[PDB]
Design an enzyme around this catalytic site. Sequence first.
Site, PDB file in Angstrom:
ATOM      1  N   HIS A 108      11.270  81.681  -7.950  1.00  0.00           N
ATOM      2  CA  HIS A 108      12.557  81.020  -8.225  1.00  0.00           C
ATOM      3  C   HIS A 108      12.341  80.188  -9.481  1.00  0.00           C
ATOM      4  O   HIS A 108      11.273  79.556  -9.577  1.00  0.00           O
ATOM      5  CB  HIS A 108      12.994  80.140  -7.036  1.00  0.00           C
ATOM      6  CG  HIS A 108      13.039  80.870  -5.727  1.00  0.00           C
ATOM      7  ND1 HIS A 108      14.185  81.454  -5.255  1.00  0.00           N
ATOM      8  CD2 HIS A 108      12.063  81.160  -4.848  1.00  0.00           C
ATOM      9  CE1 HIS A 108      13.917  82.034  -4.085  1.00  0.00           C
ATOM     10  NE2 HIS A 108      12.629  81.902  -3.835  1.00  0.00           N
TER      11      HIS A 108
ATOM     12  N   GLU B 299      12.503  75.130  -5.563  1.00  0.00           N
ATOM     13  CA  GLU B 299      13.345  74.997  -4.367  1.00  0.00           C
ATOM     14  C   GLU B 299      12.891  73.745  -3.638  1.00  0.00           C
ATOM     15  O   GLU B 299      13.677  72.854  -3.433  1.00  0.00           O
ATOM     16  CB  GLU B 299      13.193  76.267  -3.542  1.00  0.00           C
ATOM     17  CG  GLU B 299      13.740  77.480  -4.274  1.00  0.00           C
ATOM     18  CD  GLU B 299      14.219  78.578  -3.378  1.00  0.00           C
ATOM     19  OE1 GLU B 299      13.450  79.055  -2.537  1.00  0.00           O
ATOM     20  OE2 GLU B 299      15.389  78.949  -3.528  1.00  0.00           O
TER      21      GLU B 299
ATOM     22  N   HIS C  78      18.203  89.145  -7.114  1.00  0.00           N
ATOM     23  CA  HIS C  78      18.107  87.693  -6.825  1.00  0.00           C
ATOM     24  C   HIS C  78      16.798  87.087  -7.341  1.00  0.00           C
ATOM     25  O   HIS C  78      16.739  85.859  -7.498  1.00  0.00           O
ATOM     26  CB  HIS C  78      18.273  87.509  -5.328  1.00  0.00           C
ATOM     27  CG  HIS C  78      19.546  88.109  -4.824  1.00  0.00           C
ATOM     28  ND1 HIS C  78      19.581  89.169  -3.943  1.00  0.00           N
ATOM     29  CD2 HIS C  78      20.829  87.781  -5.080  1.00  0.00           C
ATOM     30  CE1 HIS C  78      20.832  89.451  -3.666  1.00  0.00           C
ATOM     31  NE2 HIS C  78      21.612  88.606  -4.340  1.00  0.00           N
TER      32      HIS C  78
ATOM     33  N   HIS D 195       7.316  86.506  -4.920  1.00  0.00           N
ATOM     34  CA  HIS D 195       8.432  86.424  -5.857  1.00  0.00           C
ATOM     35  C   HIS D 195       8.510  84.989  -6.351  1.00  0.00           C
ATOM     36  O   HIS D 195       7.765  84.125  -5.879  1.00  0.00           O
ATOM     37  CB  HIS D 195       9.742  86.859  -5.178  1.00  0.00           C
ATOM     38  CG  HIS D 195      10.104  85.964  -4.043  1.00  0.00           C
ATOM     39  ND1 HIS D 195       9.682  86.184  -2.752  1.00  0.00           N
ATOM     40  CD2 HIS D 195      10.783  84.807  -4.041  1.00  0.00           C
ATOM     41  CE1 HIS D 195      10.095  85.172  -1.989  1.00  0.00           C
ATOM     42  NE2 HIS D 195      10.791  84.318  -2.762  1.00  0.00           N
TER      43      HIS D 195
HETATM   44  C1  LIG Z   1      16.539  90.834   7.473  1.00  0.00           C
HETATM   45  C2  LIG Z   1      15.235  91.496   7.168  1.00  0.00           C
HETATM   46  O1  LIG Z   1      15.012  92.695   7.353  1.00  0.00           O
HETATM   47  C3  LIG Z   1      14.108  90.629   6.618  1.00  0.00           C
HETATM   48  C4  LIG Z   1      12.705  91.190   6.767  1.00  0.00           C
HETATM   49  C5  LIG Z   1      11.856  90.735   5.566  1.00  0.00           C
HETATM   50  C6  LIG Z   1      12.827  89.816   4.807  1.00  0.00           C
HETATM   51  C7  LIG Z   1      12.529  89.528   3.344  1.00  0.00           C
HETATM   52  C8  LIG Z   1      11.124  88.964   3.146  1.00  0.00           C
HETATM   53  C9  LIG Z   1      10.828  88.644   1.700  1.00  0.00           C
HETATM   54  C10 LIG Z   1      11.862  87.670   1.109  1.00  0.00           C
HETATM   55  C11 LIG Z   1      11.688  86.252   1.654  1.00  0.00           C
HETATM   56  C12 LIG Z   1      12.717  85.296   1.058  1.00  0.00           C
HETATM   57  O2  LIG Z   1      12.574  83.960   1.630  1.00  0.00           O
HETATM   58  S1  LIG Z   1      11.804  82.856   0.840  1.00  0.00           S
HETATM   59  N1  LIG Z   1      12.567  82.658  -0.531  1.00  0.00           N
HETATM   60  O3  LIG Z   1      11.941  81.741   1.691  1.00  0.00           O
HETATM   61  O4  LIG Z   1      10.472  83.312   0.582  1.00  0.00           O
HETATM   62  C13 LIG Z   1      14.117  85.732   1.346  1.00  0.00           C
HETATM   63  C14 LIG Z   1      14.305  87.147   0.773  1.00  0.00           C
HETATM   64  C15 LIG Z   1      13.311  88.192   1.296  1.00  0.00           C
HETATM   65  C16 LIG Z   1      13.547  89.442   0.442  1.00  0.00           C
HETATM   66  C17 LIG Z   1      13.596  88.542   2.778  1.00  0.00           C
HETATM   67  C18 LIG Z   1      15.028  89.068   3.095  1.00  0.00           C
HETATM   68  C19 LIG Z   1      15.253  89.400   4.575  1.00  0.00           C
HETATM   69  C20 LIG Z   1      14.207  90.395   5.082  1.00  0.00           C
HETATM   70  C21 LIG Z   1      14.416  91.723   4.343  1.00  0.00           C
HETATM   71 ZN   LIG Z   2      11.533  82.524  -2.181  1.00  0.00          ZN
END
Ligand SMILES: CC(=O)[C@H]1CC[C@H]2[C@@H]3CC[C@@H]4C[C@H](OS(N)(=O)=O)CC[C@]4(C)[C@H]3CC[C@]12C
Ligand SMILES: [Zn+2]
EC number: 4.2.1.1
Length: 258
Positions: free
Chosen positions: A94, A104, A62, A92
């Site tokens: 976008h 975003e 993603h 990361h």
């Molecule tokens: C469900 C879970 O375990 C959470 C803990 C940390 C989270 C991650 C933190 C880092 C980024 C943040 C990101 O949100 S953002 N784009 O608003 O910064 C969504 C994906 C992800 C991989 C997240 C996905 C859901 C995660 C894995």
């Molecule tokens: Zn993000």
Amino acid sequence: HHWGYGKHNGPEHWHKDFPIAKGERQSPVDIDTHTAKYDPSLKPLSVSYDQATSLRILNNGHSFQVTFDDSQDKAVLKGGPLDGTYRLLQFHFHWGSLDGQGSEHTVDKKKYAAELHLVHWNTKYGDVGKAVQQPDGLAVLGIFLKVGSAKPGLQKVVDVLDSIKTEGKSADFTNFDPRGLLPESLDYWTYPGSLTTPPLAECVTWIVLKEPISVSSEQVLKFRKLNFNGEGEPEELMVDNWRPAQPLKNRQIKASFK
Ligand SMILES: CC(=O)[C@H]1CC[C@H]2[C@@H]3CC[C@@H]4C[C@H](OS(N)(=O)=O)CC[C@]4(C)[C@H]3CC[C@]12C
Ligand SMILES: [Zn+2]
């Protein structure tokens, strides 16, 4: 099916697997600069990245992410709108298929070419899995990218993306200094929101910097060569991995600056 950014699995479908997609504090939002209230009680942002320890760079299907050692208070965000201390987990981006989209958040409906997210979690909850279940669990520092002059501090990232082209691929990415990605000003907007990808958890204090960084066309073109797909699968360029602005609903965006 499994979510993504395409016609059949993109943002307009996410609510089916993640009903909180239609919640009361979803991200991103449009920042209407004339409606955001200057809050003179907001403190300067404290960014302490001198002891940051980057570990790995990963294509997660993603975005791509640079992951840090968050087992100690080495790279922390505090102050600003925050109570307590937030450890850097990862950053990361976008980005778009073309320079006129990719961010975003938007500013008076303006879309930037890309948006950098530095993701931090509140140490009072002990781990990020616990933090995402809390309304003040995460603080995401959002930085806009426009296209013009190169960002020298981004080049070490751009130069390894050929090694993580497809979903699942990772590489060693030690000694990367994320201070090289920051603009001059830490003037910011803040509001309560969410993760912008599934699971869209409503756990984020958003801190969006007013000042973009400039990156070169050559740097953003290297982002656009990444692949959503895994190595043996039909090639689908990793572009337009952004969620559009969501309803502001019963929320106030506060400005740290006049
Ligand atoms: C469900 C879970 O375990 C959470 C803990 C940390 C989270 C991650 C933190 C880092 C980024 C943040 C990101 O949100 S953002 N784009 O608003 O910064 C969504 C994906 C992800 C991989 C997240 C996905 C859901 C995660 C894995
Ligand atoms: Zn993000």
